[PDB]
Design an enzyme around this catalytic site. Structure first.
Site, PDB file in Angstrom:
ATOM      1  N   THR A 172      -1.070   3.946  -7.889  1.00 50.66           N
ATOM      2  CA  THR A 172      -1.464   5.314  -8.202  1.00 50.66           C
ATOM      3  C   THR A 172      -0.354   6.075  -8.917  1.00 50.66           C
ATOM      4  O   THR A 172      -0.640   6.968  -9.721  1.00 50.66           O
ATOM      5  CB  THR A 172      -1.878   6.042  -6.922  1.00 50.66           C
ATOM      6  OG1 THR A 172      -2.662   5.158  -6.111  1.00 50.66           O
ATOM      7  CG2 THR A 172      -2.710   7.275  -7.245  1.00 50.66           C
ATOM      8  N   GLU A 213       0.822  -1.216   0.000  1.00 49.23           N
ATOM      9  CA  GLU A 213       0.000   0.000   0.000  1.00 49.23           C
ATOM     10  C   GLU A 213       0.856   1.266   0.000  1.00 49.23           C
ATOM     11  O   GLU A 213       0.512   2.269   0.630  1.00 49.23           O
ATOM     12  CB  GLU A 213      -0.987   0.008   1.171  1.00 49.23           C
ATOM     13  CG  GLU A 213      -1.917  -1.191   1.203  1.00 49.23           C
ATOM     14  CD  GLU A 213      -2.686  -1.293   2.503  1.00 49.23           C
ATOM     15  OE1 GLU A 213      -3.523  -0.405   2.771  1.00 49.23           O
ATOM     16  OE2 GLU A 213      -2.455  -2.260   3.258  1.00 49.23           O
ATOM     17  N   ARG A 260      -4.573 -14.713 -24.197  1.00 47.47           N
ATOM     18  CA  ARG A 260      -3.379 -14.436 -23.413  1.00 47.47           C
ATOM     19  C   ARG A 260      -3.561 -14.893 -21.971  1.00 47.47           C
ATOM     20  O   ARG A 260      -4.632 -14.736 -21.380  1.00 47.47           O
ATOM     21  CB  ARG A 260      -3.060 -12.941 -23.452  1.00 47.47           C
ATOM     22  CG  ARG A 260      -1.756 -12.555 -22.770  1.00 47.47           C
ATOM     23  CD  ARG A 260      -1.531 -11.054 -22.808  1.00 47.47           C
ATOM     24  NE  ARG A 260      -0.344 -10.666 -22.057  1.00 47.47           N
ATOM     25  CZ  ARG A 260       0.072  -9.415 -21.905  1.00 47.47           C
ATOM     26  NH1 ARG A 260      -0.581  -8.400 -22.446  1.00 47.47           N
ATOM     27  NH2 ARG A 260       1.171  -9.179 -21.194  1.00 47.47           N
ATOM     28  N   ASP A 316       7.134  -4.031 -12.422  1.00 50.64           N
ATOM     29  CA  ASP A 316       6.578  -4.164 -11.081  1.00 50.64           C
ATOM     30  C   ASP A 316       6.760  -5.610 -10.633  1.00 50.64           C
ATOM     31  O   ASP A 316       6.142  -6.522 -11.192  1.00 50.64           O
ATOM     32  CB  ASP A 316       5.107  -3.759 -11.057  1.00 50.64           C
ATOM     33  CG  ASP A 316       4.589  -3.526  -9.654  1.00 50.64           C
ATOM     34  OD1 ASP A 316       5.408  -3.506  -8.712  1.00 50.64           O
ATOM     35  OD2 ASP A 316       3.362  -3.362  -9.491  1.00 50.64           O
ATOM     36  N   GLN A 333       5.759 -11.080  -7.141  1.00 51.25           N
ATOM     37  CA  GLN A 333       6.707 -12.137  -6.811  1.00 51.25           C
ATOM     38  C   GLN A 333       6.894 -12.168  -5.300  1.00 51.25           C
ATOM     39  O   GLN A 333       7.559 -11.299  -4.731  1.00 51.25           O
ATOM     40  CB  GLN A 333       8.038 -11.908  -7.521  1.00 51.25           C
ATOM     41  CG  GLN A 333       8.030 -12.252  -8.994  1.00 51.25           C
ATOM     42  CD  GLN A 333       8.005 -13.744  -9.241  1.00 51.25           C
ATOM     43  OE1 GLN A 333       8.571 -14.523  -8.475  1.00 51.25           O
ATOM     44  NE2 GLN A 333       7.348 -14.150 -10.315  1.00 51.25           N
TER      45      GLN A 333
HETATM   46  N1  VSN Z   1      -5.626   9.686  -0.770  1.00 57.53           N
HETATM   47  C1  VSN Z   1      -4.707   8.937  -1.409  1.00 57.53           C
HETATM   48  N2  VSN Z   1      -4.851   7.613  -1.458  1.00 57.53           N
HETATM   49  C2  VSN Z   1      -3.914   6.840  -2.109  1.00 57.53           C
HETATM   50  C3  VSN Z   1      -2.788   7.445  -2.739  1.00 57.53           C
HETATM   51  N3  VSN Z   1      -2.050   6.495  -3.288  1.00 57.53           N
HETATM   52  C4  VSN Z   1      -2.673   5.331  -3.026  1.00 57.53           C
HETATM   53  N4  VSN Z   1      -3.772   5.503  -2.334  1.00 57.53           N
HETATM   54  C5  VSN Z   1      -4.641   4.435  -1.914  1.00 57.53           C
HETATM   55  O1  VSN Z   1      -3.804   3.322  -1.597  1.00 57.53           O
HETATM   56  C6  VSN Z   1      -4.161   2.158  -2.378  1.00 57.53           C
HETATM   57  C7  VSN Z   1      -3.033   1.814  -3.330  1.00 57.53           C
HETATM   58  O2  VSN Z   1      -2.059   1.039  -2.657  1.00 57.53           O
HETATM   59  P1  VSN Z   1      -1.573  -0.380  -3.364  1.00 57.53           P
HETATM   60  O3  VSN Z   1      -2.133  -1.517  -2.614  1.00 57.53           O
HETATM   61  O4  VSN Z   1      -2.049  -0.410  -4.838  1.00 57.53           O
HETATM   62  O5  VSN Z   1       0.028  -0.461  -3.316  1.00 57.53           O
HETATM   63  P2  VSN Z   1       1.109  -1.552  -3.882  1.00 57.53           P
HETATM   64  O6  VSN Z   1       2.523  -1.144  -3.423  1.00 57.53           O
HETATM   65  O7  VSN Z   1       0.775  -2.951  -3.319  1.00 57.53           O
HETATM   66  S1  VSN Z   1       1.031  -1.595  -5.772  1.00 57.53           S
HETATM   67  C8  VSN Z   1      -5.399   2.667  -3.188  1.00 57.53           C
HETATM   68  O8  VSN Z   1      -6.596   2.030  -2.726  1.00 57.53           O
HETATM   69  C9  VSN Z   1      -5.442   4.149  -2.909  1.00 57.53           C
HETATM   70  O9  VSN Z   1      -6.778   4.554  -2.587  1.00 57.53           O
HETATM   71  C10 VSN Z   1      -2.632   8.901  -2.684  1.00 57.53           C
HETATM   72  O10 VSN Z   1      -1.722   9.499  -3.182  1.00 57.53           O
HETATM   73  N5  VSN Z   1      -3.632   9.544  -2.006  1.00 57.53           N
END
Ligand code: VSN
Ligand code: A1CMV
Ligand code: CLR
Ligand code: CLR
Lengths: 286, 55, 344, 335
Positions: C45, C40, C168, C190, C194
């Site tokens: 984003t 997260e 695919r 990305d 993994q």
């Molecule tokens: N307000 C605000 N919310 C954000 C921002 N960036 C991400 N989120 C929230 O965070 C999750 C992505 O995290 P994700 O799980 O895809 O990460 P990952 O490393 O596994 S790919 C999504 O649901 C987003 O609503 C931001 O800038 N502002």
């Protein structure tokens, strides 16, 4: 009598230093490192230019020593054509190396695809081809004439001898001193300003001394070219303008100014090959 | 459930037949000196029958 | 002494060499990027904020390679259905028996067997029983294969990217997104899918241009869900420290992103940063806490003479994200060109 | 509770192995002649890969071989005349394994995309298509070997191996039990068993038909990267990151021989026996291959000449050559 001794000595030491340096550079860049990069192809072709250029020094040296050229018109044609042609290839390779580094620094996105070994090969072939275009008149104009009972070989011309003589003087002064100096100074100055603007060469002591190292290398290259090529071209110009009387001092000065350009040919492998950090890494395993 | 599966697997591995190291090493030796003439990397073959030669 | 077979083999290898040479020339012009981060962080984003190009689908070099896959999947789905409803006319049974005789052959299904199943579509209960069969392991796109395949019958049957993506297989692991910006081509990877062992595939990159490690800034007061005792920001710090001081990544630069710019600001306008850093007490304001987090996150870089770290803030920032990545990449390209030029 | 039962069961297995041992392999082979200094020359050099080669596999005809590198290419070579029969552009550039069908009609590869792609080499069009893409692994594909023209066994990063039906596209059999990332598998000569080494420093023998594990071998320390059966199928040798190769045994279920040296501290990437089995070859991270004597635990040769990490290696079926690949984008063939 000692003036001939000193002129023979300076020609001999310049010839042996240039031949040894440009042979060892070729041996390293063929055996240890290869021609898989653009800069290595450029350095190898500059080494060929400098080595074939300074192999004509024994012929001019023995021509001055005896005062008579006994090798015939064919060997004089070969020697003087190799001299002019390889000096022009060496100067053109210096110009294209400065252009290559300027493009690598100031235009990096375009240098992603421009700076390839195949393009370097094409540019080198173009350099040798334009030097052929500028040196085939030396092939078809050199001859061995007779004067005062001695035998000397120079370039002969058409009925307007002054016009073609001054045309060759102009095409050597501008196309081998004025244009190369402007190109190399503009390219290196823009490269140095851009490297002063880059993040990884500023903001710390070690980054600053690295940037000063590239700046000092640039200044050394430009200064060596200018100091080695200025006296001979100035001497040629002012000998064309006013009549310098034949004396010991002017003969020694003229031969020293000739030797300065070949000294630049000797110092090119030191400044360009031996000061590369890729070459220093190749020497570090020894 | 993982512990029971691991115990059952280890028990099934436990009740297997084992032969002595002497007879198995002798079998390995019998294979090694039974095929020594058939190994080109072991005994260097003549260049007449070598399909990897310079051109 | 060599006949025409050796000449043909030599010419074939020559054209293979030409293809490999042009493919390697095109690939050396690219810029490879390793997108990393914790859970997260905001990587999804960040990638969504790029929005130029985010997929693949080359016109001819990969549509040819999936031609037999479409026929194979169609035949496999129809035989899965015909073996699935078992365990109103016999002409359909005869057609099915004709299908089963020629089912061992693949590559030329587009006309004859296509017409056979086209005539076999007279049954109305077969699709109802296919919808009823939700227990057997079969692809849910069986009708999505059969419906649009028989509408056209050509010898050189090369469909568009719709049928290629139809057959695919989705990649659970590495995800590749190709985008271009200002006459320079990027390629982001990305590796978040993994979850096996980072130390066994982290050397597969070895020469990426940069690393686009993303760190959520709001996690200074969010505890890890699996431990409830140790902070999320310190997990991100440990991951960043392990990425920086890796033997495989010893000279690559890092475009570090600090993600939730407004979230941690509105968080620290109530709760101080002392809970994350007990050794720190300078201000509970936005600017000083952001600068302190950035500087405490940059000193993890042990070698400060060869590796440069570029830090940026995000969360509804404009195209300055892509511009920041481009500036870092152009600095790396200048460094690499200096190293290639014998000047560094 | 049951953990003590598992511990005492493992102790019973260890005690049965200890009582099963009566003579070391070094003691049995103490009176045979040494193989002598074996010095192979680079007969062929396969240039054409532009990136990091990760795997190779010889064909059964002992003339062709496929290799995979990180430029997204899959080149089949003619080793006799230094030609390139095929060059397959992979969908995913990240490839770590490649396989060659025993009939020569197919070729496999896989990597970080968790997909084992099968390519039909003998299509009527002339080029190389894709016959089937195998999905179901949640980890990276690290090895794959063809049982026959229709079945392939693969190892993955999800600590499990699997067996596939190519014409169907699904897993007929799943092999679970490794508590760690399995990195390589080798197939038995009779195509009835296989053995796979994992990151928990254990090598497990599996059954293809019934899908159960028979033996587990836990002699190594760090993690297994290499594994290869003896030509008779009654033994195998495992390479690992603790600079050690170990010869295990099927019927004895023990450790037979350790091939290690004091100045070798780098990991082993790949192993393969010769035709007789007397000569076990192994590639290393210190840029060269070490040729070992599988009966006497002494080094017989050194296969230098690679500027980067020798990552893959394989002795051909009739034993006339060994081909080693490397991270320096070159393949070499030795004799
Ligand atoms: N307000 C605000 N919310 C954000 C921002 N960036 C991400 N989120 C929230 O965070 C999750 C992505 O995290 P994700 O799980 O895809 O990460 P990952 O490393 O596994 S790919 C999504 O649901 C987003 O609503 C931001 O800038 N502002
Ligand atoms: C004429 N100028 C102004 C030059 O700068 C020159 C060429 C001078 N070189 C001297 C010997 C020579 O006269 C000769 C050769 C053979 C014989 Cl058997 C007899 C006489 C032929 C001409 C140069 C000056 C100093 C060092 C090196 C070269 C040059 C520079 C750059 C490009 C082309 C030419
Ligand atoms: C036009 C006529 C008079 C010129 C005759 C000489 C020409 C053909 C020769 C002289 C030196 C030669 C070059 C010497 C070295 C190299 C580097 C190599 O990696 C590619 C070929 C290349 C670039 C050669 C091309 C041909 C070349 C330019
Ligand atoms: C900028 C640096 C390289 C200095 C350049 C020095 C130049 C201008 C010098 C070097 C050698 C000099 C020449 C040496 C010898 C003579 C002969 C004398 O009877 C008249 C002056 C004359 C013809 C000199 C003119 C100026 C000259 C060409």
């Amino acid at each position: 009598m000692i003036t001939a001794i000193t002129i023979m000595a300076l020609y001999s030491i310049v010839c042996v230093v240039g031949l040894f340096g440009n042979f060892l550079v070729m041996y390293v860049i063929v055996r240890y490192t290869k021609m898989k990069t653009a800069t290595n192809i450029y350095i190898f072709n500059l080494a060929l230019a400098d080595a074939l250029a300074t192999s004509t020094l024994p012929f001019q040296s023995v021509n001055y020593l005896m005062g008579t050229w006994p090798f015939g018109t064919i060997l004089c044609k070969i020697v003087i054509s190799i001299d002019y042609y390889n000096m022009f290839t060496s100067i053109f390779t210096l110009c294209t190396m400065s252009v290559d580094r300027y493009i690598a620094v100031c235009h990096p996105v375009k240098a992603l695809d421009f700076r390839t070994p195949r393009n370097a090969k094409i540019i080198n072939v173009c350099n040798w081809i334009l030097s052929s275009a500028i040196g085939l008149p030396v092939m078809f104009m050199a001859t061995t004439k007779y004067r005062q009972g001695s035998i000397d070989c120079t370039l002969t011309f058409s009925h307007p001898t002054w016009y073609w003589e001054n045309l060759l003087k102009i095409c050597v002064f501008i196309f081998a001193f004025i244009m190369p100096v402007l190109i190399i100074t503009v390219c290196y100055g823009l490269m140095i300003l851009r490297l002063k603007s880059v993040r990884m060469l500023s903001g710390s002591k070690e980054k600053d001394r690295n940037l000063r190292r590239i700046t000092r290398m640039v200044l050394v290259v430009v200064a060596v070219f200018i100091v080695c090529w200025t006296p001979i071209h100035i001497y040629v110009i002012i000998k064309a303008l006013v009549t310098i009387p034949e004396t010991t001092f002017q003969t020694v000065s003229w031969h020293f100014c000739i030797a300065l350009g070949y000294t630049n040919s000797c110092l090119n492998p030191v400044l360009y090959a031996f000061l590369d950090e890729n070459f220093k890494r190749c020497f570090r395993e020894f | 459930a993982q512990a029971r599966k691991l115990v059952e697997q280890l028990k099934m591995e436990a009740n297997i037949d084992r032969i002595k190291v002497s007879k198995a090493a002798a079998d390995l030796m019998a294979y090694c000196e039974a095929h020594a003439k058939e190994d080109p990397l072991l005994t260097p073959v003549p260049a007449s029958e070598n399909p990897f030669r310079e051109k | 002494t060599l006949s025409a077979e050796d000449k043909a083999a030599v010419e074939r290898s020559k054209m293979i060499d030409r293809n490999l040479r042009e493919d390697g020339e095109k690939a050396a012009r690219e810029v490879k990027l390793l997108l990393l981060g914790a859970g997260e962080s905001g990587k999804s984003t960040i990638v969504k904020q790029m929005k130029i190009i985010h997929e693949a689908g080359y016109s001819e070099e990969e549509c040819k390679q999936y031609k037999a896959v479409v026929y194979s999947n169609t035949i496999q789905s129809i035989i899965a259905i015909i073996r699935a409803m078992g365990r109103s006319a016999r002409a359909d049974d005869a057609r099915q028996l004709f299908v089963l005789a020629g089912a061992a052959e693949e590559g030329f299904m587009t006309a004859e067997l296509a017409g056979v199943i086209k005539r076999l579509w007279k049954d109305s209960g077969v699709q109802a029983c296919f919808n009823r069969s939700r227990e057997y392991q079969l692809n849910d796109s069986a009708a999505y294969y059969l419906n649009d395949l028989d509408r056209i019958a050509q010898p050189n049957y090369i469909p568009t990217q719709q049928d290629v993506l139809r057959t695919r297989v989705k990649t659970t692991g590495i995800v590749e997104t190709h985008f271009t910006f200002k006459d320079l081509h990027f390629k982001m990877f990305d590796v978040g899918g993994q979850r096996s062992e980072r130390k066994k595939w982290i050397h597969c990159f070895e020469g990426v241009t940069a690393i686009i490690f993303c760190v959520a800034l709001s996690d200074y007061d969010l505890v890890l869900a699996e431990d409830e005792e140790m902070n999320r920001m310190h997990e991100s710090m440990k991951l960043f420290d392990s990425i920086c001081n890796n033997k495989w990544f010893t000279d690559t630069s890092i475009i570090l992103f600090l993600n939730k710019k407004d979230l941690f600001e509105e968080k620290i306008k109530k709760s101080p940063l002392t809970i994350c850093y007990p050794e720190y007490a300078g201000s509970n304001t936005y600017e000083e806490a952001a600068a302190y987090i950035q500087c405490q996150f940059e000193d993890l870089n042990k070698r400060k003479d060869t590796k440069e770290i570029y830090t940026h803030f995000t969360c509804a920032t404009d195209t300055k994200n892509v511009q920041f990545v481009f500036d870092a990449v152009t600095d790396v390209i200048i460094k690499n060109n200096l190293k290639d030029c014998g000047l560094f | 509770q049951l953990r003590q039962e598992a511990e005492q069961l493992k102790n019973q297995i260890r005690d049965a192995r200890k009582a099963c041992a009566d003579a070391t392999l070094s003691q049995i082979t103490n009176n045979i002649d040494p193989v002598g200094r074996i010095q192979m020359r680079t007969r062929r050099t396969l240039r054409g890969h532009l990136a990091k080669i990760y795997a190779m596999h010889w064909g059964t005809d002992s003339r062709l071989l496929v290799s995979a590198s990180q430029d997204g290419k899959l080149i089949i070579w003619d080793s006799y005349t230094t030609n390139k029969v095929h060059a397959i552009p992979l969908r995913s550039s990240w490839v770590m394994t490649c396989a060659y069908a025993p009939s020569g009609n197919y070729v496999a590869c896989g990597g970080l995309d968790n997909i084992c792609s099968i390519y039909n080499l003998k299509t009527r069009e002339g080029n190389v298509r894709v016959s089937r893409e195998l999905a179901g692994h949640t980890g990276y594909l690290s090895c794959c070997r063809f049982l026959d023209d229709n079945q392939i066994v693969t190892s993955s990063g999800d600590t499990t191996c699997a067996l596939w039906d190519i014409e169907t596209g699904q897993q007929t059999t799943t092999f679970t039990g490794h508590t760690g990332d399995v990195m390589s598998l080798s197939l038995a000569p009779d195509t009835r068993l296989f053995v796979s080494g994992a990151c928990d420093a254990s090598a497990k023998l599996w059954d293809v038909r019934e899908g159960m594990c028979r033996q587990t071998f836990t002699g190594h320390e760090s993690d297994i990267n290499a594994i290869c059966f003896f030509p008779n199928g009654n033994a195998f040798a495992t390479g690992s990151d603790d600079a050690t190769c170990r010869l295990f045994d099927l019927r004895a279920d023990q450790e037979l021989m350790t091939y290690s040296h004091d100045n070798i501290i780098c990991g082993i990437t790949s192993v393969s026996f010769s035709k007789s089995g007397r000569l076990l070859l192994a590639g290393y991270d210190d840029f060269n291959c070490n040729v070992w004597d599988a009966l006497k635990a002494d080094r017989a040769g050194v296969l230098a000449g690679h500027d980067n990490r020798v990552s893959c290696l394989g002795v051909t079926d009739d034993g006339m050559a060994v081909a080693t690949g490397s991270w320096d984008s070159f393949l070499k063939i030795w004799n």
